[PDB]
Design a protein around this nucleic acid. Structure first.
Ligand SMILES: [Zn+2]
Lengths: 96, 243, 144, 49, 98, 346, 90
DNA sequence: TGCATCCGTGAGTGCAG
DNA sequence: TATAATGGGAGCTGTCACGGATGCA
């Protein structure tokens, strides 16, 4: 919304668009550094004002919410590497 | 009896007959999955195709558990999990007033009933009462997770708005998938009224310059240095903040 | 390493416990006077996380070098407030309770796995009928 | 319509205090809580479709 | 001061000014938090001869792509006659722009 | 199918007592309590520890938990074990095992026998923050109190005494769980005191009262200031999903900016400070920009006054507070050429 | 319709409406509502003895409609859109 | 066994709101 | 802490179409 100083909603249908073009990097951008990849988002704007190319992104934060929200329903979602052993997309901050 | 000095015996058995998730976690726990496979196929041999049909449906679910390693009993929680606070916050809005997720009022709702049952236990209350606390306990947990799915939906007082339960968050056009994973909002974007420019070449467009500035604001801060309309980027920003 | 698949599966009670950082004991949010979180309720920091980055709850330890000591006085880790986003709590139920998805998602997954009618699972679960587990020879109207 | 629903709510609030609290030292003044009415009117005009 | 040359003693733009994006319309101060100056900051001031200030600029500026000519102002405190606002609010200022 | 009409049915099952059965059951309970401490001065075990063991066997093993407050975890071994040194007694002492067991069983049928009453009390306490049932349990909860504290000898019908503990526990729960932010019961207590006295003021005024007109009718120690800040905590929070518009594709929580997490302008700012300040330590001296680099901290800060400054710096105590001055002093003329630090005060 | 209330009984005599505590424009400014105080006279009468009390208790403020057809509700004009519906009948 | 019959699930985009 | 008091109360309405699971001549 203009009054909140909004962002433009890039919807399912816009994602399709980029998909059909095959602009993987432009879409990914939309889905990480331009929206909620808090790490690479902060990382990017620092890269521009420093005159550097933007950095390859990490996992969007809204996906993490999707994990934690499936735990709260007692479902154990799990990122895994090709050799089937888990991968912490929380960098140890939720293990003891 | 000490007045009649008789020892009375009332005709009645030591039967074990229970109620609710307490029961079922047992029956699920006493399921030798391999066994039931054996019988269901050993019955997949039947004619009339109607028995053969549902021993497939059922058997599918057995092997679903066998192949994965899940235990059937696990579809009954003893420990219900709680979702980190920040994902269901309590916030002071501008007026120092607070805005809170629907989940707290759903948890609280459940935490009371679990608590008041932990008490009703030790104070030894009749079944007819402990029964009602347990029932009320499912409907608690059944509304935290999928409010309105079964029975009436959990309404805050003075409104008729169903509270937003965990499944309601996950699902729907407004849910987490379709509204935040298959497409978000974005930085570096603008909107405006369009207008024909017949002077453009095919590959061009008319971007008003006020929009331009913002959509490129980082880039403009760095350039603004490399020439020097400001000393460093931070002062560069404070220039463009008033017109 | 690099993500390549994503597995989804049931969380055992012991596993739910695995994730949890503390039994939410009280139905309390946050103190109507200090507007801070009541301990042992839904927002407690000794469970979920420091509310301010690398700052303990009461004053005890307040910056990066003490990173990971649960101060003794208030009991709160010294890490980034970003963990209030990821650290699960758990409520520890008195009598077991069914996950409604595996009940009311037709065809039932608990109701087919035990040859239990739709409407039986209700009665036995919402307490409209008993379900005999060991009849110790009982007998009703002339039938064991 | 919204008025006829505030009035009926006030009437759940009189009879409640008509059979608990003292069945002879009572006036209209203190048997009527105006609020169930005040609210259904505030409602109609501030959040109706 | 250039950034205030249109505000009256109290912190209101003068009726009849020209206001554009960035301009303060009503200055305001709120107190800083438990992030009251952290080390990084307590030092930067240590060099400049001003110590950390205890209040904050929360001035009501003007939004991007808005503005015009202040035509009126309304200032409602509490402690003034006729007036009483929602609990906990001292004063509420409205400035109509044309 | 409807969770009230159901409980209303289980209740219609246990019939209403009669005046005799009232006193009979009431009677058998009081004796069984007496019987327990008499039955604890013979054995010396413990009143409660015993009563729980009487309770176990009478109700069935269907239930058992280590009752917090008793000192042994009441597992059915210490119930056989203690039902034994109990049933081991001489007929004129183990006389009172029979007395407790009979009394516990009257407890049960006296609670179950007076559930209808609670219904018709909690019925009147709806629309108050608590679900009918929720009020019922809280109601029954008290009803339990009422039996363990009844005295049939006073010749009262049981109704009369319980209709106090019932409405004592409804009102306590209506005041201890209703609000998302829990407030002490005595503060709730006085809040409603405004609500009520303001209401009459309005009913006398033809308009709502002011803060002042309240502090007057509220009496002494009540000023206009203190009725205000009382309301501003009476204030119930509002739902983040409160629906926006008259379609519903918006949520009042979406219009709320997250001001905890640092913005990218922000978290970028902190990095061009904490390094363009490391850009003024090793530019004029890095060991006098280390003794002052431990008069604070590049992360964690290091600042007390005079005590660790006197421990391990290299030099003496009031000599680092001088190269502290020449540390700073070198930095105020250091930053008269690399003038790229002013802009960080905004 | 709602009166009289029943077992004691409380019966309805008449209502009155008073002029607004603030004129149309004053409410537009002060984010008030353009409304009139609603009084209603009642008489309590005892289902057993013959009790008679009679107060005119104050019921709140009913908001008033201006000359052109609008309303003022916390100081913003509003319209009440007539609604079409299937009508009562068989 | 074939076929009523019920219950649960869907029902376009973004923007102003 | 004690006259006595012992089973609730609002439903809400004019869509649709498909697929799956359950009941019944
Ligand atoms: Zn501490």
């Amino acid at each position: 919304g203009k009054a909140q100083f909004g962002g433009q909603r890039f919807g399912e249908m816009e994602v399709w668009a980029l998909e059909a073009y095959g602009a993987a990097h432009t879409l990914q951008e939309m889905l990480t550094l331009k929206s909620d990849d808090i790490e690479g988002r902060n990382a990017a704007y620092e890269a521009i004002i420093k005159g550097e190319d933007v950095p390859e992104p990490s996992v969007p934060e809204s996906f993490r919410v999707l994990v934690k929200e499936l735990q709260a329903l007692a479902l154990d979602v799990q990122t895994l590497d090709e050799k089937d052993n888990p991968v912490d997309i929380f960098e140890g901050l939720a293990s003891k | 009896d000490l007045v009649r000095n008789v020892v009375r015996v009332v005709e009645s058995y030591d039967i074990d007959a229970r109620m609710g998730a307490e029961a079922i976690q047992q029956l699920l726990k006493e399921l030798d999955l391999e066994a039931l496979e054996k019988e269901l196929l050993e019955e997949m041999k039947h004619p009339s195709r109607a028995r053969r049909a549902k021993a497939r449906k059922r058997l599918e679910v057995v092997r679903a558990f066998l192949d994965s390693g899940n235990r059937p009993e696990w579809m009954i929680l003893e420990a219900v999990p709680v979702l980190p606070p920040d994902l269901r916050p309590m916030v002071q809005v501008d007026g120092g007033r607070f805005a809170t997720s629907d989940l707290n009022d759903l948890y609280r709702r459940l935490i009371n009933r679990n608590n008041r049952l932990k008490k009703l236990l030790a104070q030894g209350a009749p079944e007819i009462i402990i029964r009602n606390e347990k029932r009320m306990l499912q409907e608690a947990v059944d509304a935290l997770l999928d409010n309105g799915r079964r029975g009436a939906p959990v309404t805050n007082p003075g409104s008729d708005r169903p509270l937003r339960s965990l499944t309601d968050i996950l699902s729907g056009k407004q849910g987490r998938f379709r509204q935040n994973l298959l497409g978000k909002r974005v930085d570096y974007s603008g909107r405006s009224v369009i207008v024909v420019g017949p002077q453009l070449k095919l590959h061009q467009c008319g971007l008003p310059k006020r929009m331009a500035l913002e959509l490129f604001k980082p880039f403009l801060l760095k350039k603004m240095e490399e020439k020097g309309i400001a000393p460093n980027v931070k002062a560069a920003r404070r220039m463009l903040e008033r017109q | 390493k690099e993500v390549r698949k994503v597995r989804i599966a049931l969380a055992s009670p012991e596993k739910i416990r695995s994730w949890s950082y503390g039994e939410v004991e009280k139905p309390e949010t946050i103190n109507y006077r200090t507007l801070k979180p009541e301990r042992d309720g839904l927002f407690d920091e000794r469970i979920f996380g420091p509310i301010k980055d690398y700052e303990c709850a009461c004053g005890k330890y307040k910056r990066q070098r003490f990173e990971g000591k649960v101060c003794e006085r208030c009991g709160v880790e010294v890490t980034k407030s970003i963990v209030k986003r990821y650290r699960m709590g758990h409520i520890e139920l008195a009598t077991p309770a069914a996950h409604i998805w595996f009940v009311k998602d037709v065809p039932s997954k608990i109701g087919t796995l035990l040859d239990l009618s739709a409407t039986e699972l209700e009665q036995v679960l919402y307490f409209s009928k008993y379900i005999v587990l060991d009849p110790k020879g009982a007998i009703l109207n002339g039938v064991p | 319509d919204q008025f006829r629903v505030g009035l009926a709510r006030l009437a759940r609030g009189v009879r409640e205090r008509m059979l608990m609290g003292s069945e002879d030292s009572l006036t209209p003044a203190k048997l009527v809580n105006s609020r169930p009415l005040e609210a259904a009117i505030r409602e109609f005009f501030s959040r109706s479709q | 001061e250039a950034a205030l040359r249109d505000l009256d003693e109290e912190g209101v733009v003068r009726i009849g000014a020209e206001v554009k994006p960035g301009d303060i319309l009503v200055g305001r101060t709120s107190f800083k938090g438990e992030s009251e100056p952290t080390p990084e900051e307590r030092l930067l001031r240590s060099i400049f001869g001003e110590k950390a200030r205890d209040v904050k600029d929360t001035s009501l500026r003007v939004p991007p792509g808005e503005g015009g000519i202040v035509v009126r102002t309304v200032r409602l405190r509490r402690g003034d006659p006729g007036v009483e606002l929602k609990p906990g609010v001292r004063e509420v200022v409205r400035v109509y722009v044309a | 199918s409807d969770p009230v009409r159901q409980y209303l049915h289980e209740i219609g099952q246990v019939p209403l007592l009669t005046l005799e059965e009232e006193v009979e059951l009431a009677r058998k309970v009081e004796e069984g309590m007496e019987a327990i401490k008499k039955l604890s001065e013979i054995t010396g075990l413990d009143p409660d520890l015993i009563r729980e063991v009487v309770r176990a066997k009478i109700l069935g093993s269907a239930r058992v938990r280590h009752i917090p407050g008793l000192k042994e975890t009441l597992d059915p071994k210490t119930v056989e074990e203690i039902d034994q040194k109990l049933k081991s007694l001489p007929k004129e002492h183990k006389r009172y095992l029979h007395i407790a067991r009979e009394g516990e069983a009257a407890r049960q049928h006296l609670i179950e026998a007076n559930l209808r009453l609670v219904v018709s009390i909690a019925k009147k306490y709806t629309g108050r923050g608590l679900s009918f049932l929720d009020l019922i349990q809280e109601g029954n909860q008290g009803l339990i109190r009422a039996v363990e504290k009844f005295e049939y000898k006073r010749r009262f019908k049981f109704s009369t005494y319980a209709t106090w503990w019932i409405r004592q526990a409804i009102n306590r729960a209506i005041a201890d769980q209703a609000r998302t932010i829990r407030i002490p019961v005595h503060m709730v207590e006085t809040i409603n005191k405004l609500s009520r006295t303001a209401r009459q003021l309005q009913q006398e005024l033809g308009r709502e009262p002011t803060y002042e007109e309240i502090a007057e009718a509220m009496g002494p120690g009540w000023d206009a200031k203190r009725v205000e800040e009382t309301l501003k905590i009476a204030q119930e929070p509002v739902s983040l999903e409160t629906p926006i518009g008259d379609e519903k594709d918006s949520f009042y929580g979406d219009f709320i900016p997250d001001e905890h997490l640092p913005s990218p302008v922000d978290a970028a700012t902190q990095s061009l400070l904490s390094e363009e300040l490391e850009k003024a330590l090793s530019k004029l001296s890095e060991r006098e920009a280390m003794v002052l680099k431990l008069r604070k901290g590049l992360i964690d800060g290091r600042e007390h006054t005079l005590e660790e400054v006197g421990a391990f710096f290299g030099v003496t105590r009031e000599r680092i507070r001088q190269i502290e001055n020449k540390a700073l002093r070198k930095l105020k003329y250091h930053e008269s050429r690399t003038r790229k630090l002013r802009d960080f005060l905004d | 319709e709602t009166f009289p209330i029943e077992e004691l009984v409380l019966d309805f005599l008449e209502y009155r409406l008073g002029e607004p505590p603030f004129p149309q424009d004053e409410c537009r400014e002060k984010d008030l509502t353009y409304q009139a105080p609603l009084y209603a006279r009642l008489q309590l009468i005892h289902k057993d003895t013959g009790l008679i009390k009679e107060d005119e208790v104050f019921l709140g403020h009913i908001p008033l409609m201006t000359e052109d057809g609008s309303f003022i509700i916390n100081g913003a004009d509003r319209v009440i859109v007539s609604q079409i519906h299937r009508s009562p009948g068989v």
